[PDB]
């Protein structure tokens with residue numbers, strides 16, 4: 144192994160699924176969220192992009208995906224008994240969907 | 241030299257991440273802003289020269305109004321005490337004026353000068369580049385981290401041991417123009433500011449004055 | 455002996471042995487068995 148980071152790998156990676164929360168791991172940086180297609184273009188030196196300190200864009204197979212936080216990862220239980228409880232998702236906005 | 245474009249230095253700087261709208265401090269082997277380090281105007285036939293540095297940066301002057309006369313910049317970076325199992329680099333270009341350059345970091349068996357083919361070659365590709373208003377590139381071996389910077393892209397390989405010092409660069413002398421070369425000796429520290437998408441558009445080297453260090 | 459540089463490419467299944475399935479079987483571990491190394495120094499031996 145003359146170099147670290149040349150990365151011979153079986154089975155070339157494929158386009159990810161846009162619209163489901165999944166914990167990715169892209170170029171030594173693991174993160175969790177959903178992806179969507181964007182018309183945002185950034186510098187070819189970089190695949191990851193940071194706005195401040197949060198990951199905002201990834202670039203996979205030449206396609207730029209804007210990273211969003213998945214809002215349904217956490218909930219409270221308004222617990223009364225075994226057959227009656229309520230659920231509250233404190234960080235999800237259910238105005239539309 | 242005399243006509244070194246210092247506004248082309250923006251195209252070669254990179255931060256370690258992709259950062260948006262951000263002022264950052266980067267360090268490494270970056271080209272000298274002193275005009276007394278750009279070997280540019282040699283008419284003696286020794287435009288070849290050599291260097292004992294840690295990288296080299298090349299800047300083609302301008303291509304807007306010779307024509308077909310472009311740079312050649314044959315670069316043969318040497319692992320100063322050469323054996324059979326060491327690594328050399330040989331970046332080559334002809335007059336063009338079309339795109340095709342070549343890199344070919346291979347493992348050769350002699351020192352005198354780039355045959356048809358060699359054994360055990362790590363990178364071997366064309367990677368074509370188009371001429372711009374003015375173009376600037378450079379390759380870097382600082383603690384054996386090879387960085388071939390052809391803007392916009394980049395190529396990085398951390399090899400375990402090279403000990404590259406000798407450069408043996410060479411351009412076609414007495415050409416239509418004179419491409420300028422910069423052999424870097426020590427690492428610097430630069431204050432850069434990136435734009436919307438992550439591209440550097442302002443720089444200041446930290447050791448070029450009193451205010452620059454503040 | 456001729457060498458090969460492997461970088462930025464896709465290695466393929468068991469195309470470093472002869473297609474007979476008796477000889478190479480000393481490099482078989484488990485159901486995941488495509489392991490071309492025997493003793494490793496000092497990296498972790500299993501290639502997955």
Ligand SMILES: *[C@@H]1O[C@H](CO)[C@@H](O[C@@H]2O[C@H](CO)[C@@H](O)[C@H](O)[C@H]2NC(C)=O)[C@H](O)[C@H]1NC(C)=O
Nearest residue numbers: 183193194195199259260261262435436437438
């Ligand atoms: C980086 O900076 C630019 C410039 O400040 C930002 O562009 C602005 O974006 C807002 C939307 O949030 C617009 O209302 C402004 O009109 C834009 N200004 C200009 C001058 O274009 C950009 O959004 C910033 N952030 C990035 C790229 O993530």
Ligand SMILES: *[C@@H]1O[C@H](CO)[C@@H](O)[C@H](O)[C@H]1NC(C)=O
Nearest residue numbers: 223224225226227228229230
């Ligand atoms: C949820 O609503 C349904 C309505 O039939 C019923 O099971 C119950 O009233 C509520 N709570 C739970 C825990 O099911």
Ligand SMILES: *[C@@H]1O[C@H](CO)[C@@H](O)[C@H](O)[C@H]1NC(C)=O
Nearest residue numbers: 346357358359360361364365
């Ligand atoms: C390098 O690339 C050229 C062009 O494809 C080819 O002719 C040559 O054999 C290659 N050399 C090696 C060592 O792969």
